[PDB]
Structures are given as C-alpha cells and as structure tokens.
Design a protein around this nucleic acid. Sequence first.
RNA 1: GUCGACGUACUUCAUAGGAUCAUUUCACUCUUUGACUCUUCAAAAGAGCCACUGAAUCCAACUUGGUUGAU
Length: 130
Amino acid sequence: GGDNSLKEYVFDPQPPRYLRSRGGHSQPPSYIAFADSQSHFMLSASKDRSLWSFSLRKDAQSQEMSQRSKFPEIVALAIENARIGEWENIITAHKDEKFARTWDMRNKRVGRWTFDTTDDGFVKSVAMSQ
RNA sequence: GUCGACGUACUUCAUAGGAUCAUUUCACUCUUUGACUCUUCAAAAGAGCCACUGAAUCCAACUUGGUUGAU
C-alpha cells in the first residue's frame, strides 16, 4: 500500500494468514540513537507511534520493537549499552505524560518500570550514567 | 657360635573302573524377551526473543434446575 510495508498473505490450505512482512515507520521519524559501539543496530522512534530497531548492514533486515492503541510518541530518548541482556537500558519520555518508561535492548520488548516526576510536571529530559 | 651322630612329630612321596562331550506349508491358544509412550524413589537447558493463530484449567459474571430436596 502507501504505508511503507509489504506483507505476504498465504492461504494455508479457508482464511489466509500473515506469513512474513517488511515495513517501517509510515510517518517520518522523530528521534534516533546509536545502540552499539560497532555500528550495527540503530534505535528509531517516529510520530506514527511505532518503535523500530533497524540494522545498518547489507541485509537491511530490521525489527519493530515489542510494546507489550499505540503508545504516545517519544520526545526524549536515552540509551546505554553497558548492561545489555540483563535488565532494561533504554529510557523514553512521551508527549504530555508524567512517567518515563524503560526498554530492553536485548529482548526487543518493553520495560517493566514507569518513572514518576513527583512534582506533577511533564518529563522534559532523560539521561543515564555510564 | 657351629658341625657331627640318637630320638619324636609333621607334612608330602597312591592316580582304579566307566559313561558323556567336542574330533565320525494353514490356523488357534499359551509363555518369554526387547522396543515405543507415560510415570514413581530426581536436576537441568537449548536451537535463548517477539509476533498471528489453536486448545485446556481455575476464579468472577450470565442462563437452567433445585428445601415440592442439589451435593
């Protein structure tokens, strides 16, 4: 379609089925960041409220993250790659919200923590240590 | 200390006959063993993560029937 994605639907022998697909952000992006010290995976967030982690290499395979009606868009992002694989290491704010969510770089899946301002404001800036 | 001769005790010094063994179709019932699946006297992980779909169990909610008696 016009939404920057191809999807293969196959009639498993009767309804069809989502077989395999490739796509991306339908709307242009808002904030990106480099995830590795080896120039392989980039982290990307847009205004159509999806979240994709792309590769850079010759394949151009990529993977949309797991958010698990979309979430509000990201205005402030921060990333560290020091403790990958163990717990969450990506910190995201959202427009007009009061809590900053976390994210795992390893499992491509959302975090388990919501972060409070404790002053009833909006989250304007995020940061992590080394 | 050693050797000569006397004594006592010890053990050991028998290997008979004859056999044997090497060389001269069709079906039913029952019995034994092994394999597959699962489980009891028990720890792990990987090919580890996210998707769309399928099935089960429990608690809540809804209907049916029940003191002229459900369990």
